[PDB]
Amino acid sequence: ATCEKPKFLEYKTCVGDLTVVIAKALDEFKEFCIVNAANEHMTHGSGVAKAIADFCGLDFVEYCEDYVKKHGPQQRLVTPSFVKGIQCVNNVVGPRHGDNNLHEKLVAAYKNVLVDGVVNYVVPVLSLGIFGVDFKMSIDAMREAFEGCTIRVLLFSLSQEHIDYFDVTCK
């Protein structure tokens, strides 16, 4: 029933990179939003940003560049993906480690994932800088953000241990 709202919050997990998770999402959701852990300037030099930029292509990249150029930096930019099956890319700028109210800002970052009309999401564990630093806070924050929502979330990370923490905290 993957183009309808779920009855309640549903999760999927993937230990894998963007390539792997996108393939899994295409297969299991068919249609979905990819969340990109972005910077304000929507640059894609490295990491998931670079991965999404490479995967989505020049039209995606040009879209983001022109937007920031014309409209200035963005903390949440929902863009076209230019990829069949990918309803949109939600470029979410999360907090950095040591920021004031890290937890609150993490919750706010995950609440920014939601896109009106979009029911299926691929969501990375938002990093605070260094890989794995506060993944527990980040995953906890996601759940708080998503509480009660009628969405499906395919959470992915390159680390099994991030996924195991998700697993053990499922309730």
PDB file of C-alpha atoms in Angstrom:
ATOM      1  CA  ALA A   1       0.000   0.000   0.000  1.00  0.00           C
ATOM      2  CA  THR A   2       3.167   2.037  -0.473  1.00  0.00           C
ATOM      3  CA  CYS A   3       1.592   5.059  -2.204  1.00  0.00           C
ATOM      4  CA  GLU A   4      -0.918   5.422   0.659  1.00  0.00           C
ATOM      5  CA  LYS A   5      -0.164   6.717   4.142  1.00  0.00           C
ATOM      6  CA  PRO A   6       0.698   3.856   6.458  1.00  0.00           C
ATOM      7  CA  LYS A   7      -1.655   3.209   9.371  1.00  0.00           C
ATOM      8  CA  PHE A   8       1.165   4.334  11.614  1.00  0.00           C
ATOM      9  CA  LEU A   9       4.879   5.090  11.659  1.00  0.00           C
ATOM     10  CA  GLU A  10       6.861   2.405   9.813  1.00  0.00           C
ATOM     11  CA  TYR A  11      10.606   1.865   9.686  1.00  0.00           C
ATOM     12  CA  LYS A  12      12.970  -0.002   7.418  1.00  0.00           C
ATOM     13  CA  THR A  13      16.770  -0.168   7.906  1.00  0.00           C
ATOM     14  CA  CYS A  14      19.736  -0.437   5.623  1.00  0.00           C
ATOM     15  CA  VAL A  15      23.411  -0.840   6.595  1.00  0.00           C
ATOM     16  CA  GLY A  16      24.852   0.482   3.404  1.00  0.00           C
ATOM     17  CA  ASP A  17      25.750   3.472   1.381  1.00  0.00           C
ATOM     18  CA  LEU A  18      23.439   5.745  -0.647  1.00  0.00           C
ATOM     19  CA  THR A  19      23.639   3.509  -3.626  1.00  0.00           C
ATOM     20  CA  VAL A  20      22.508   0.522  -1.661  1.00  0.00           C
ATOM     21  CA  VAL A  21      19.717   2.362   0.225  1.00  0.00           C
ATOM     22  CA  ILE A  22      18.358   3.987  -2.922  1.00  0.00           C
ATOM     23  CA  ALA A  23      18.131   0.610  -4.606  1.00  0.00           C
ATOM     24  CA  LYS A  24      16.385  -0.843  -1.597  1.00  0.00           C
ATOM     25  CA  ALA A  25      13.996   2.167  -1.429  1.00  0.00           C
ATOM     26  CA  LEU A  26      13.212   1.920  -5.186  1.00  0.00           C
ATOM     27  CA  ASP A  27      12.416  -1.680  -4.600  1.00  0.00           C
ATOM     28  CA  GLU A  28      10.463  -1.445  -1.386  1.00  0.00           C
ATOM     29  CA  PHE A  29       8.820   2.008  -1.507  1.00  0.00           C
ATOM     30  CA  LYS A  30       8.757   2.550  -5.197  1.00  0.00           C
ATOM     31  CA  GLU A  31       8.243   6.292  -4.536  1.00  0.00           C
ATOM     32  CA  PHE A  32       9.985   8.232  -1.756  1.00  0.00           C
ATOM     33  CA  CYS A  33      11.870  11.300  -0.650  1.00  0.00           C
ATOM     34  CA  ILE A  34      15.634  11.100  -0.075  1.00  0.00           C
ATOM     35  CA  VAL A  35      16.828  13.193   2.834  1.00  0.00           C
ATOM     36  CA  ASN A  36      20.231  14.765   2.265  1.00  0.00           C
ATOM     37  CA  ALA A  37      22.205  15.977   5.211  1.00  0.00           C
ATOM     38  CA  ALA A  38      23.020  19.303   3.548  1.00  0.00           C
ATOM     39  CA  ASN A  39      24.946  22.416   4.252  1.00  0.00           C
ATOM     40  CA  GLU A  40      23.304  25.886   4.029  1.00  0.00           C
ATOM     41  CA  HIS A  41      24.957  26.541   0.633  1.00  0.00           C
ATOM     42  CA  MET A  42      23.829  23.237  -0.761  1.00  0.00           C
ATOM     43  CA  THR A  43      27.339  22.261  -1.741  1.00  0.00           C
ATOM     44  CA  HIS A  44      28.087  18.623  -2.269  1.00  0.00           C
ATOM     45  CA  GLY A  45      31.858  18.312  -1.888  1.00  0.00           C
ATOM     46  CA  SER A  46      31.809  15.173   0.232  1.00  0.00           C
ATOM     47  CA  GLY A  47      29.881  12.517   2.030  1.00  0.00           C
ATOM     48  CA  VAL A  48      26.157  11.946   1.531  1.00  0.00           C
ATOM     49  CA  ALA A  49      25.808  15.424  -0.098  1.00  0.00           C
ATOM     50  CA  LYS A  50      28.352  14.438  -2.770  1.00  0.00           C
ATOM     51  CA  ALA A  51      26.768  10.990  -3.050  1.00  0.00           C
ATOM     52  CA  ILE A  52      23.227  12.459  -3.630  1.00  0.00           C
ATOM     53  CA  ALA A  53      24.644  15.088  -6.038  1.00  0.00           C
ATOM     54  CA  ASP A  54      26.434  12.356  -7.978  1.00  0.00           C
ATOM     55  CA  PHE A  55      23.465  10.050  -7.946  1.00  0.00           C
ATOM     56  CA  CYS A  56      20.908  12.704  -8.923  1.00  0.00           C
ATOM     57  CA  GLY A  57      23.089  14.373 -11.524  1.00  0.00           C
ATOM     58  CA  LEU A  58      23.766  17.746 -13.104  1.00  0.00           C
ATOM     59  CA  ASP A  59      20.131  18.953 -13.120  1.00  0.00           C
ATOM     60  CA  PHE A  60      19.955  18.309  -9.408  1.00  0.00           C
ATOM     61  CA  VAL A  61      23.222  20.055  -8.836  1.00  0.00           C
ATOM     62  CA  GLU A  62      22.363  22.948 -11.097  1.00  0.00           C
ATOM     63  CA  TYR A  63      18.993  23.257  -9.383  1.00  0.00           C
ATOM     64  CA  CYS A  64      20.596  23.658  -5.965  1.00  0.00           C
ATOM     65  CA  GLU A  65      23.294  25.996  -7.193  1.00  0.00           C
ATOM     66  CA  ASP A  66      20.911  28.352  -8.964  1.00  0.00           C
ATOM     67  CA  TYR A  67      18.579  28.299  -5.950  1.00  0.00           C
ATOM     68  CA  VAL A  68      21.205  29.309  -3.459  1.00  0.00           C
ATOM     69  CA  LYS A  69      22.594  31.786  -5.990  1.00  0.00           C
ATOM     70  CA  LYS A  70      19.145  33.372  -6.457  1.00  0.00           C
ATOM     71  CA  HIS A  71      17.594  32.868  -3.049  1.00  0.00           C
ATOM     72  CA  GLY A  72      20.494  32.607  -0.672  1.00  0.00           C
ATOM     73  CA  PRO A  73      21.463  29.833   1.764  1.00  0.00           C
ATOM     74  CA  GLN A  74      18.695  27.391   2.790  1.00  0.00           C
ATOM     75  CA  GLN A  75      18.257  25.360   5.993  1.00  0.00           C
ATOM     76  CA  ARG A  76      15.721  23.078   4.351  1.00  0.00           C
ATOM     77  CA  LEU A  77      15.496  22.875   0.618  1.00  0.00           C
ATOM     78  CA  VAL A  78      13.099  20.436  -0.976  1.00  0.00           C
ATOM     79  CA  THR A  79      14.235  20.039  -4.536  1.00  0.00           C
ATOM     80  CA  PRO A  80      13.474  17.887  -7.485  1.00  0.00           C
ATOM     81  CA  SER A  81      15.527  14.730  -7.632  1.00  0.00           C
ATOM     82  CA  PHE A  82      15.492  14.251 -11.450  1.00  0.00           C
ATOM     83  CA  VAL A  83      15.413  10.527 -10.771  1.00  0.00           C
ATOM     84  CA  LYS A  84      12.454   8.360 -11.430  1.00  0.00           C
ATOM     85  CA  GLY A  85      10.928   7.053  -8.203  1.00  0.00           C
ATOM     86  CA  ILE A  86      12.482   9.813  -6.146  1.00  0.00           C
ATOM     87  CA  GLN A  87       9.661  12.236  -5.454  1.00  0.00           C
ATOM     88  CA  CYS A  88      12.101  14.845  -4.154  1.00  0.00           C
ATOM     89  CA  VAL A  89      15.315  15.510  -2.245  1.00  0.00           C
ATOM     90  CA  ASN A  90      14.914  17.115   1.097  1.00  0.00           C
ATOM     91  CA  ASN A  91      18.188  18.902   1.817  1.00  0.00           C
ATOM     92  CA  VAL A  92      18.117  19.286   5.504  1.00  0.00           C
ATOM     93  CA  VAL A  93      20.823  21.271   7.295  1.00  0.00           C
ATOM     94  CA  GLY A  94      21.236  19.713  10.754  1.00  0.00           C
ATOM     95  CA  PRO A  95      23.238  20.981  13.724  1.00  0.00           C
ATOM     96  CA  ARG A  96      26.986  20.716  14.315  1.00  0.00           C
ATOM     97  CA  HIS A  97      28.606  19.139  17.463  1.00  0.00           C
ATOM     98  CA  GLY A  98      28.735  21.407  20.521  1.00  0.00           C
ATOM     99  CA  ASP A  99      26.008  23.744  19.100  1.00  0.00           C
ATOM    100  CA  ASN A 100      23.671  25.192  21.734  1.00  0.00           C
ATOM    101  CA  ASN A 101      20.691  22.859  22.373  1.00  0.00           C
ATOM    102  CA  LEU A 102      22.015  20.017  20.185  1.00  0.00           C
ATOM    103  CA  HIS A 103      19.107  17.748  21.045  1.00  0.00           C
ATOM    104  CA  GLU A 104      16.484  20.378  20.271  1.00  0.00           C
ATOM    105  CA  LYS A 105      18.169  21.211  17.046  1.00  0.00           C
ATOM    106  CA  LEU A 106      18.420  17.551  16.115  1.00  0.00           C
ATOM    107  CA  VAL A 107      14.660  17.152  16.720  1.00  0.00           C
ATOM    108  CA  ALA A 108      14.037  20.268  14.613  1.00  0.00           C
ATOM    109  CA  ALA A 109      16.285  18.904  11.813  1.00  0.00           C
ATOM    110  CA  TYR A 110      14.355  15.601  11.713  1.00  0.00           C
ATOM    111  CA  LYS A 111      10.968  17.386  11.883  1.00  0.00           C
ATOM    112  CA  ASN A 112      12.189  19.206   8.699  1.00  0.00           C
ATOM    113  CA  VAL A 113      12.325  15.843   6.899  1.00  0.00           C
ATOM    114  CA  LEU A 114       8.591  15.700   6.508  1.00  0.00           C
ATOM    115  CA  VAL A 115       7.316  16.970   3.173  1.00  0.00           C
ATOM    116  CA  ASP A 116       3.635  17.531   2.697  1.00  0.00           C
ATOM    117  CA  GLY A 117       2.151  14.746   0.583  1.00  0.00           C
ATOM    118  CA  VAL A 118       5.266  12.594   0.924  1.00  0.00           C
ATOM    119  CA  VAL A 119       4.769   9.430   2.907  1.00  0.00           C
ATOM    120  CA  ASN A 120       8.002   7.418   2.263  1.00  0.00           C
ATOM    121  CA  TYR A 121      11.413   8.687   3.246  1.00  0.00           C
ATOM    122  CA  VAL A 122      15.007   7.565   3.085  1.00  0.00           C
ATOM    123  CA  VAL A 123      16.689   9.120   6.124  1.00  0.00           C
ATOM    124  CA  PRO A 124      20.323   9.044   7.131  1.00  0.00           C
ATOM    125  CA  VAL A 125      21.389   9.302  10.708  1.00  0.00           C
ATOM    126  CA  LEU A 126      22.224  12.962  11.014  1.00  0.00           C
ATOM    127  CA  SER A 127      25.908  13.337  12.053  1.00  0.00           C
ATOM    128  CA  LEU A 128      27.024  16.154  14.255  1.00  0.00           C
ATOM    129  CA  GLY A 129      30.441  16.197  12.455  1.00  0.00           C
ATOM    130  CA  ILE A 130      32.521  13.078  13.103  1.00  0.00           C
ATOM    131  CA  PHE A 131      31.055   9.751  12.043  1.00  0.00           C
ATOM    132  CA  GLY A 132      29.168   8.138  14.914  1.00  0.00           C
ATOM    133  CA  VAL A 133      29.450  11.150  17.253  1.00  0.00           C
ATOM    134  CA  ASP A 134      26.181  11.185  19.136  1.00  0.00           C
ATOM    135  CA  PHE A 135      24.344   8.729  16.720  1.00  0.00           C
ATOM    136  CA  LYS A 136      22.303   7.745  19.758  1.00  0.00           C
ATOM    137  CA  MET A 137      21.256  11.316  20.294  1.00  0.00           C
ATOM    138  CA  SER A 138      20.599  11.681  16.601  1.00  0.00           C
ATOM    139  CA  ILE A 139      18.457   8.479  16.371  1.00  0.00           C
ATOM    140  CA  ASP A 140      16.610   9.385  19.582  1.00  0.00           C
ATOM    141  CA  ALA A 141      15.957  12.818  18.136  1.00  0.00           C
ATOM    142  CA  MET A 142      14.565  11.263  14.925  1.00  0.00           C
ATOM    143  CA  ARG A 143      12.062   9.195  16.866  1.00  0.00           C
ATOM    144  CA  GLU A 144      10.915  12.227  18.864  1.00  0.00           C
ATOM    145  CA  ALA A 145      10.571  14.101  15.640  1.00  0.00           C
ATOM    146  CA  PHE A 146       8.641  11.329  13.932  1.00  0.00           C
ATOM    147  CA  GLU A 147       6.445  10.375  16.848  1.00  0.00           C
ATOM    148  CA  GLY A 148       2.938   9.614  15.690  1.00  0.00           C
ATOM    149  CA  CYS A 149       3.602  10.408  12.028  1.00  0.00           C
ATOM    150  CA  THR A 150       2.025   8.312   9.309  1.00  0.00           C
ATOM    151  CA  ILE A 151       5.155   7.917   7.293  1.00  0.00           C
ATOM    152  CA  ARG A 152       7.604   5.236   6.364  1.00  0.00           C
ATOM    153  CA  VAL A 153      11.240   5.743   7.115  1.00  0.00           C
ATOM    154  CA  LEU A 154      14.083   3.727   5.681  1.00  0.00           C
ATOM    155  CA  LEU A 155      16.878   4.700   8.039  1.00  0.00           C
ATOM    156  CA  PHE A 156      20.336   3.968   6.758  1.00  0.00           C
ATOM    157  CA  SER A 157      23.907   4.181   7.966  1.00  0.00           C
ATOM    158  CA  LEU A 158      27.182   2.640   6.941  1.00  0.00           C
ATOM    159  CA  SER A 159      27.438   1.457  10.550  1.00  0.00           C
ATOM    160  CA  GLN A 160      25.651  -1.687  11.808  1.00  0.00           C
ATOM    161  CA  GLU A 161      26.063  -0.298  15.295  1.00  0.00           C
ATOM    162  CA  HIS A 162      23.879   2.699  14.485  1.00  0.00           C
ATOM    163  CA  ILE A 163      21.267   0.296  13.128  1.00  0.00           C
ATOM    164  CA  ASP A 164      21.620  -1.953  16.183  1.00  0.00           C
ATOM    165  CA  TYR A 165      20.907   1.010  18.399  1.00  0.00           C
ATOM    166  CA  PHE A 166      17.785   1.766  16.378  1.00  0.00           C
ATOM    167  CA  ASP A 167      16.877  -1.881  16.699  1.00  0.00           C
ATOM    168  CA  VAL A 168      17.245  -2.102  20.475  1.00  0.00           C
ATOM    169  CA  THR A 169      15.363   1.138  21.035  1.00  0.00           C
ATOM    170  CA  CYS A 170      12.367   0.102  18.914  1.00  0.00           C
ATOM    171  CA  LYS A 171       9.184   0.264  20.901  1.00  0.00           C
TER     172      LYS A 171
END
